[PDB]
Ligand binder design. Sequence first.
Ligand SMILES: Nc1ncnc2c1ncn2[C@@H]1O[C@H](COP(=O)(O)OP(=O)(O)OP(=O)(O)O)[C@@H](O)[C@H]1O
Ligand SMILES: Nc1ncnc2c1ncn2[C@@H]1O[C@H](COP(=O)(O)OP(=O)(O)OP(=O)(O)O)[C@@H](O)[C@H]1O
Ligand SMILES: Nc1ccc(COC(=O)NCCCC[C@H](N)C(=O)O)cn1
Ligand SMILES: Nc1ccc(COC(=O)NCCCC[C@H](N)C(=O)O)cn1
Ligand SMILES: [K+]
Ligand SMILES: [K+]
Ligand SMILES: [K+]
Ligand SMILES: [K+]
Ligand SMILES: [K+]
Ligand SMILES: [K+]
Ligand SMILES: [Mg+2]
Ligand SMILES: [Mg+2]
Ligand SMILES: [Mg+2]
Ligand SMILES: [Mg+2]
Ligand SMILES: [Mg+2]
Ligand SMILES: [Mg+2]
Lengths: 264, 264
Amino acid sequence: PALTKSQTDRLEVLLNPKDEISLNSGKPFRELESELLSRRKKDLQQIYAEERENYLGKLEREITRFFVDRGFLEIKSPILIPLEYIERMGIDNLSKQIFRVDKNFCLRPMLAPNLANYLRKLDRALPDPIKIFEIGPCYRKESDGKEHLEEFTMLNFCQMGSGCTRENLESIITDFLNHLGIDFKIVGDSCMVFGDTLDVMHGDLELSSAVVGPIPLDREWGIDKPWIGAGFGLERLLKVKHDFKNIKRAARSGSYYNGISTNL
Amino acid sequence: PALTKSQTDRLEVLLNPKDEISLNSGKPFRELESELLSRRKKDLQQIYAEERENYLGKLEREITRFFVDRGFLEIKSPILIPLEYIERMGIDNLSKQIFRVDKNFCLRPMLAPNLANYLRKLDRALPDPIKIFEIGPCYRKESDGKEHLEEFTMLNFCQMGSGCTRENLESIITDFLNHLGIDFKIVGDSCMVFGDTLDVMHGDLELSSAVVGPIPLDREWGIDKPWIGAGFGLERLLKVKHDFKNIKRAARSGSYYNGISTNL
Ligand SMILES: Nc1ncnc2c1ncn2[C@@H]1O[C@H](COP(=O)(O)OP(=O)(O)OP(=O)(O)O)[C@@H](O)[C@H]1O
Ligand SMILES: Nc1ncnc2c1ncn2[C@@H]1O[C@H](COP(=O)(O)OP(=O)(O)OP(=O)(O)O)[C@@H](O)[C@H]1O
Ligand SMILES: Nc1ccc(COC(=O)NCCCC[C@H](N)C(=O)O)cn1
Ligand SMILES: Nc1ccc(COC(=O)NCCCC[C@H](N)C(=O)O)cn1
Ligand SMILES: [K+]
Ligand SMILES: [K+]
Ligand SMILES: [K+]
Ligand SMILES: [K+]
Ligand SMILES: [K+]
Ligand SMILES: [K+]
Ligand SMILES: [Mg+2]
Ligand SMILES: [Mg+2]
Ligand SMILES: [Mg+2]
Ligand SMILES: [Mg+2]
Ligand SMILES: [Mg+2]
Ligand SMILES: [Mg+2]
């Protein structure tokens, strides 16, 4: 017998990349569902008995240790930010992707504006070079795709002062992704906010956009020294590490725990 | 000479609890400001040279290790949640404290609704008892006070099944606060959502509200077993640990780093 779209969708929810199960071999839906339910219950029971850490939380902690140990200050800045930061970043009325809150606020779509404010302020107190990073939630309205979430998690690290060359930026990216065990290439791209970017690609998947300053936008943020920085999506890193078909498996969710369906 | 309100406000920004400086001793504002600026620059330089971890991030990691090691599963759930969860939690049209997003969403004011969904779903797969926790941002519109932030960080841990007694709840709270070195007492209180609470107090400062289920609200969330849980504000824990006068010192902010003014 043949499987309906609803039946295939249910089996796909329960299927994991490590499995080797053909959904349309002729085995009835009831037995495919029962087999996958048993595998997923066993997987969740093993996590509960032996590990207990959330993939997104554990990755944030691993990344934090990497950057702290390399001399970058750990930042935790507001998620709810002034709407004025949007226009000030050069997001001309992308601007359609912004989640507005009340009338003067929004959910941050990126970490860069708050990190620019920290670079400017810390430059008055700390020795050259200034090295900082932040990991946390960012928000964009997106067309539902396999690589986009509306609520995702960004890492942005950046440096201002000496050492702010393309070669040093590439070297940090290389050390970071070598630490995570992720192969990549660098390709040029461009964006409306920062201009030319160095995009870090794993196949066709964009892991990061990186920027070598100065850029004209600097003046609007009081930045007046060379700088480099890069933004990475943590859910995309997890998608690569675990071979997930859809980025939803990696997201903050009530529907998946460490890539395992919670509808069991 | 006498200090103006603006001058006193500036010195208070730069003052830290460890300092022993009288603002109205007769010393001129210029010298008090210069002394405090030097102390704060030295403090920030020491953090940058030797530690580099953000207080809120470090506390979240310490708390995460405590609960993971005691058998609780680490959850990371959505911050942007359906507005329908508000009415379903019994927040009758407090409801005025909700940050609305678009027309059907809001910023979560607490972690409990997402954790209730996880308890229900995990009970179908995991052995008794189910023990989970989450740490992350929550949002409430508040009257500007010394103990309230509009963007704050909650820990909520909870357990469902066996062991869900008042004595076990108090024992977990005691072990947790003993681990952090924070003295407390338990006092009864009540709230409109959960009914009677056990409030964990440090002096007059409410560190937590805790609940022993079942409660009538359970039916609306599909919860049908005994449960216990408690919610704690991380910024309030930091305020106690570091003797901050105002909770702003502990918050996500561009204005303070580990309680040190960034306006230097
Ligand atoms: N909606 C999203 N969901 C998940 N990750 C995202 C999303 N948007 C951006 N990212 C991640 O954040 C990084 C930096 O943000 P950036 O502004 O460069 O994204 P982007 O160029 O718009 O990405 P894309 O072209 O895939 O939409 C991206 O390289 C990606 O890893
Ligand atoms: N606006 C806020 N800013 C900082 N922490 C908060 C805030 N609201 C709640 N908390 C923290 O979260 C815990 C659990 O939330 P709960 O709903 O019990 O707060 P609450 O009873 O409204 O607190 P309060 O009476 O001080 O307003 C509180 O005990 C407190 O530690
Ligand atoms: N003027 C300044 C100065 C310094 C910074 C520090 O921030 C950075 O390192 N940016 C790096 C690119 C991240 C990609 C981004 N998420 C985007 O939407 O393309 C910001 N602005
Ligand atoms: N029906 C159910 C069942 C289980 C849970 C799990 O969540 C909890 O442990 N709550 C503990 C109290 C936290 C205080 C809260 N921030 C407030 O606003 O008073 C929730 N609901
Ligand atoms: K598979
Ligand atoms: K998606
Ligand atoms: K999400
Ligand atoms: K003082
Ligand atoms: K406040
Ligand atoms: K804040
Ligand atoms: Mg995009
Ligand atoms: Mg792109
Ligand atoms: Mg990009
Ligand atoms: Mg309150
Ligand atoms: Mg209260
Ligand atoms: Mg309370």
